[PDB]
Amino acid sequence: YFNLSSIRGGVHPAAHKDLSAALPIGSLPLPPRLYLPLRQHAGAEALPMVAVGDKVLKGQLLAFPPTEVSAPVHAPTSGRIVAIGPVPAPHPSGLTTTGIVLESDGEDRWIDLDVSTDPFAEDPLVLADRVAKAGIVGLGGAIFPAAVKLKQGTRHEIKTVLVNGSECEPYLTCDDRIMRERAEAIVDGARLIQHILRAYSVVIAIEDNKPEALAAMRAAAEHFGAIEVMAVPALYPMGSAKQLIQAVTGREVPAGGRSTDVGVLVHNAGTVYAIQQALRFGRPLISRVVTVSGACVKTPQNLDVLIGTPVQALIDACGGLSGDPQQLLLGGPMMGAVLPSTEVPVIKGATGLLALARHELPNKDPAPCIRCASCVDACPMGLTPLDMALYARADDYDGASEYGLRDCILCGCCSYVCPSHIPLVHYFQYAKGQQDERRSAARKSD
Amino acid sequence: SVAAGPFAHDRSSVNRIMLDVCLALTPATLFGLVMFGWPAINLWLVTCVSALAIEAACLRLLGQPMRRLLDGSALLTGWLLAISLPPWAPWWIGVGGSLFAIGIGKQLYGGIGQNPFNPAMLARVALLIAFPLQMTTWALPHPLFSSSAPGFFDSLAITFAGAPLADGMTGATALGNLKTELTLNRTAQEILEGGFSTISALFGSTPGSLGETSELLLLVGGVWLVLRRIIHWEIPVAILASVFVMATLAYLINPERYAGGLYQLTSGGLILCAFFIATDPVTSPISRVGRLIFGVGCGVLIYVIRTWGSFPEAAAFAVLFMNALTPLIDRYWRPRAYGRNVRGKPLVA
């Protein structure tokens, strides 16, 4: 503890968190139809179990995992299946994907949940498989199944459960409100995780730019001992698992290794809240919290949205587009993607619905690199982005891999501090995609 | 085509950097121009205009967009070359230096960000080698509006054409005078007792280059540049520390032969080279240890060629040599990654 800070890089972008983190979490009227993609997680894609025209209740297991590394899909609301086919996906390409379409009946009747009894009584494996049959996908961006992470963590020895409450992305305030209003729930979820993984204490960390969240967390968790609330600095690449681990524990996650090596596990606050809900009440992951902000939105807010709700309904709920949105990002400005259209659904990993106007989007006129070395002074991983970009532009991906293309996390600190405006992150993404394509080809060859 | 992130920026630009460097150079350039008078102004104007025109022609030939002219990469080089030249120099000296730098040194390699050598110092070295007589005629300070400096058309005849200046308007500086008097079997103390004053040399009341003469306004500009986070303190600190330490050791060993410390600092283009010229981003290391090595080597070479060399000042030669040595330093002193040791293999825990 007693954070080492360091980080060895980082930027201070405009937070813009004061225009949305005022109102409480709103609610959505039930939209007519929901589009649920069958791949809302990492790894394999779940297989459907219902047919067209079937009647399902709120919480039914529409799709099941084909392998260990997957996650089921649960019906957000009671209704009738109308399509098991192609649906638009929340991807920059705009291509379609396999997915179900559910017509909202409007009754909104819950299924007979399999509630547990005395959650602090059972062995860790039973709780882990209960989480597995809950749809938890780790709503922090990595969309990785929480059950696999917990099962792997139980194998080793864990000395600390680190709740990643440091929402660092600009314009995003979902974590702030979810921690202000659900402090008891997040503390109980942290306790349940600490029981699942035999550990010592939880070190729940929040950034210093959220005094209300810190006060609420400290008020909620002061009678139970090992629970701790920590104040990390206000840095952009601070929510990352590796950077937060280095800041709190003081060690470094070895390259090509997992967080369990240093005996620390990282979970987002929304993921821990979902785990707490699943363990205490048996409710699967059906809805989450998203942040709608930007200069083109009449009323920025945080909305509790069902999975599969179209983006257009979300925009209409918050008043409407008060002008022409130059960009419609899905997530923070440093990692968001351009939405092809407003009919795209909301996957479990969707974090924001930013509507950036012209005055918020900086102009960029690319120029030759002047080798000012401002990239090296901002990279959290201590790489040399200029050399990586030079080798990627020359199609020498092998040379770029030597300079740190393997360890890059695409945080976007490169292009933020570039005098001659260069899309360094675009180069890195293109090089990684080319490496993945070559790897796929050569693997198929075998 | 789809657009990639991030969708945020810090409003930085190359134009702002170059304009800030020119603004930092302005207080010393004004002091230099006022002290020497109209010929200095004419030389500076000619050098800057020639630099801009030749950059425009080179951009037109190579096909690059004309917006590259507006980033200040050529005006800064012209400014540095003009302030690095003798004050009462003919126009063709400045024009030839500008053509040799903007041209061979910068544009022949592709443009800004591609050249491996400092353009301004390359032009200065080429001018000194090709024309030694015109680059070793230092005019005494003749302040503007002093009743002794030439008028506005006599100064035009001085700068353009070839009218001989005078008998008595040209003197010797400090380093060259010391070396000559040492070759005149005089000890290194008598020379500095009656032929050098530190207070006047620090203010800038001595003959020299156009902007080199003042070692205080240049220091203020360099400090402001460091506080603006445009340059890194490693190179100036290393250069100044190395030169001062070597000079002090030489003075302590043989006081009657070596002069060091204040004399070495307040003489020649050491401060200007350390702050504004050796800190060229395109031709300097990108690491911290690399910058420290760059500065230490620059200081050592400058002092060595100053003391035992055949030149009275070798800031340009030291800078060019370290620019040549830069790529090896870049490829052998890369910063440590995350979760890896210095050698690069993964950490063990």
């Binding site: 996906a89 991807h91 291509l95 180069y427 993404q429 293109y430 | 085509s1 789809v2 990639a4």
Partner: peptide, 11 residues
């Protein structure tokens, strides 16, 4: 398809 979609090199 989506799984075969990859980024285009920056201009």
């Amino acid at each position: 398809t989506l799984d075969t979609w990859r980024w285009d090199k920056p201009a």
